């Protein structure tokens, strides 16, 4: 899917009322641990009312901590990462979706972060949501993304 554009919150669509706050609130967090939003961020997608931030792998175990931790984002809850694969998204097939939910703010959002085929290694954020460990060894089994750190390869 394209690019959304600004502003990414919609009158008409109340559910996408907090998207351009959370955007926003998630570059600050960035900046502040010195990490440019867009060197993290490759790319912001909205379809059918939902939110999603294309993660730089590099990068998804600080933005999953930051999303945690920092007040103005509060993201306590972690729905399940979940694994999708494109054969013909070349040097990009292995895809991994994460659903996560603020009860504080009341926002929802899904990280999305993928890897090659070639090099099919994705970070573990077990260390950040413990509760992510069985999808991500889930997403491992059916389509083998490596998650690195994760518990089970100690
Ligand atoms: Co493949």
Redesign the pocket.
Known sequence: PAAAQRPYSDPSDPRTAYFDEVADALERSLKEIGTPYDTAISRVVVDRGEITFHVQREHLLDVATRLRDDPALRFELCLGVTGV?Y?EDEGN??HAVYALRSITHNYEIRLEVSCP?SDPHIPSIVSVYPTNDWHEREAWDFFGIIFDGHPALT
Do not use: N, S, W
């Open positions: 694969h054969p097939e292995l085929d």
